[PDB]
Ligand binder design. Structure first.
Ligand code: HEM
Ligand SMILES: O=[N+]([O-])c1ccc(O)cc1
Length: 137
């Protein structure tokens, strides 16, 4: 289930982080805008860049901490608040997050693997709702 999926992702965090983020950027290419140093680079080119891997790992690390502190896929209001208040997120809406979680849920379905995709779908919805509540537009 959802706890096991956190263990699976954490187990190979850099590979899942890159694979899922790239699925996100390729599914929603206008999102590439917020990431000026990833513009005009192939998946392969990006996976060779230390800093691409480092930033995606830090994002998915924090995402896995928020997932782990959640109860029945409902995140803490304080985790939501952390995500709205970070300077790096100051020009984002809930739609940016929605799209990430649509990409994460589609990756999992398309994976060979028994991910609890419906739980990640629900976690994404709950987090987008909590982010709104904490004042993100
Ligand atoms: C659960 C979802 C997300 C989490 C946990 C998260 C977490 C983080 C973290 C930890 C950083 C700092 C990275 C570092 O210093 O290396 C960061 C930066 C950033 N995040 Fe997010 N983020 C999320 C979603 C998004 C989304 C959906 C967008 C845009 C569509 C976004 C845009 C950015 C940008 C532009 C930065 C700064 C530049 C960069 O580090 O690449 N984030 N985020
Ligand atoms: O998935 N994301 O939103 C990300 C991914 C990588 C990054 O450096 C910043 C944000």
């Amino acid at each position: 289930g959802f706890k096991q999926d956190i263990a699976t992702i954490r187990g190979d965090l850099r590979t899942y982080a890159q694979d899922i983020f790239l699925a996100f950027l390729n599914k929603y290419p206008d999102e590439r805008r917020y990431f000026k140093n990833y513009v005009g680079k192939s998946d392969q080119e990006l996976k060779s860049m230390a800093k691409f891997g480092d930033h995606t790992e830090k994002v998915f690390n924090l995402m896995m901490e928020v997932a782990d502190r959640a109860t029945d896929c409902v995140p803490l209001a304080s985790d939501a608040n952390t995500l709205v208040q970070m300077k790096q997120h100051s020009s984002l809406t809930t739609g940016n997050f929605e799209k990430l979680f649509v990409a994460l849920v589609e990756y999992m379905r398309a994976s060979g693997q028994s991910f609890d995709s419906q739980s990640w779908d629900r976690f994404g919805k709950n987090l987008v709702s909590a982010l709104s509540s904490a004042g993100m537009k």
